[PDB]
Design a protein around this ligand. Structure first.
Ligand SMILES: OC[C@@H](O)[C@@H](O[C@H]1O[C@H](CO)[C@@H](O[C@H]2O[C@H](CO)[C@@H](O)[C@H](O)[C@H]2O)[C@H](O)[C@H]1O)[C@H](O)[C@@H](O)CO
Length: 370
């Protein structure tokens, strides 16, 4: 039934747990309360299991969308940050941790796709998607392509599809309307058609995936790619001179990438909810706290305004946030899963010629609203 008087924190092995332990150290140094950081295997699957029996960690870190299912089972305590603290974070990040009208976690980091370009091949990247075909023609004359990115996952193609109007679920007043889905509308239609046209016109290949695109950019064969902060470390080793900027606009409208927010939830069965609040609010979500973690392993962009403004000195992080604010938080409802699978199938089929754009989207829409 969770031990009282200390804090047990669970965070994934690919995050800065060592850096976080540094924050726990200061917490114990000031309060005399011990903080233990653990990163068990398959922790996202373990948490709902142990938390269901009134056990598990006091605090759990994970992408915000997975917290919707946890909150649905009443695994997370409703947090109580005052207005002063709420003003400390970007407002859109608070939307990522709200379930059934209640705040159930503290936003920590922000991640979204950005346009990654090769400064030596394209020092002045295109501001619009419409400009890409002509650029590809010019680059192809050199044996290079203009753009290569993962076309197998809807997460990567959606930014373009949503640009002129596509959307997963209408987020009206604090909640998502599962009856209002925007996959089979005019905007999504135009976006997908543009994508399909790039393929038909030989500017992109329907088979291009993550690994294919990554190697191409890393070897200087393509001038641009679309990826997240998680991929930077795999480019840095490549030595290629790259930059990260805002995604291209389509029909004059900004691309709208989905946003993932690393969040920290408090176990509903924790008898240390107040200690958790103190740690998260006044130790972790401060410039000194986030610096400790970030310095260990990059968080990318962060939810805390003050520190983000400091990190933004890195154009890659600034671009990450610019795209995120123009994007949409990933919905934390069960239906979002149906959205991913249906749209994944629609884009694949439309790109291969298996389905026309109209039928692909209509079919996706019809299944998502079921
Ligand atoms: O290939 C590396 C990625 O898995 C990367 O995660 C990022 O990209 C995926 C998309 O492939 C994002 O997943 C989201 O979107 C897909 C639909 O395309 C859904 O099936 C997922 O449920 C949804 O989360 C992911 O959010 C994004 O971080 C790496 O894992 C990276 O996170 C860590 O190296």
């Amino acid at each position: 039934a969770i031990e009282e008087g200390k804090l047990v924190i669970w965070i994934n092995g690919d995050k800065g747990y060592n850096g976080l332990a540094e924050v726990g150290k200061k917490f114990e140094k000031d309060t005399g309360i011990k903080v233990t950081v653990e990163h068990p295997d398959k922790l996202e699957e373990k948490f709902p299991q142990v938390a269901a029996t009134g056990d598990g960690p006091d605090i759990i870190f994970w992408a915000h969308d997975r917290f919707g299912g946890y909150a649905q089972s009443g695994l997370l305590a409703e947090i109580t940050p005052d207005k002063a603290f709420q003003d400390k974070l970007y407002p859109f990040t608070w939307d990522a941790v709200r379930y059934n009208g209640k705040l159930i976690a503290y936003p920590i980091a922000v991640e979204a796709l950005s346009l990654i370009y090769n400064k030596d091949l394209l020092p002045n990247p295109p501001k619009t998607w419409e400009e890409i075909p002509a650029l590809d023609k010019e680059l192809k004359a050199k044996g290079k392509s203009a753009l290569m990115f993962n076309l197998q996952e809807p997460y990567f193609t959606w930014p373009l599809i949503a640009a002129d109007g596509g959307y997963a679920f209408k987020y009206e007043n604090g909640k998502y309307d599962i009856k209002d889905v925007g996959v089979d509308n005019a905007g999504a239609k135009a976006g997908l058609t543009f994508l399909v046209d790039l393929i038909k016109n030989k500017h992109m290949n329907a088979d291009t995936d993550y690994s294919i695109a990554e190697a191409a950019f890393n070897k200087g064969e393509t001038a641009m790619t679309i990826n997240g902060p998680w991929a930077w470390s795999n480019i840095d080793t490549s030595k290629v001179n790259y930059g990260v900027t805002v995604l291209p606009t389509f029909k004059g409208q900004p691309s709208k990438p989905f946003v993932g927010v690393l969040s920290a939830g408090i176990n509903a069965a924790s008898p240390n909810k107040e200690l958790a609040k103190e740690f998260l609010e006044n130790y972790l979500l401060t410039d000194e706290g986030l610096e400790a973690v970030n310095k260990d392993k990059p968080l990318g962009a962060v939810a805390l305004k003050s520190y983000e403004e400091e990190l933004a000195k890195d154009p890659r992080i600034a671009a990450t946030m610019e795209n995120a604010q123009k994007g949409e938080i990933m919905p934390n409802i069960p239906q979002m899963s149906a959205f991913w699978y249906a749209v994944r199938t629609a884009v694949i089929n439309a790109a291969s010629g298996r389905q026309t754009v109209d039928e692909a989207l209509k079919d996706a829409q019809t299944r998502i609203t079921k």
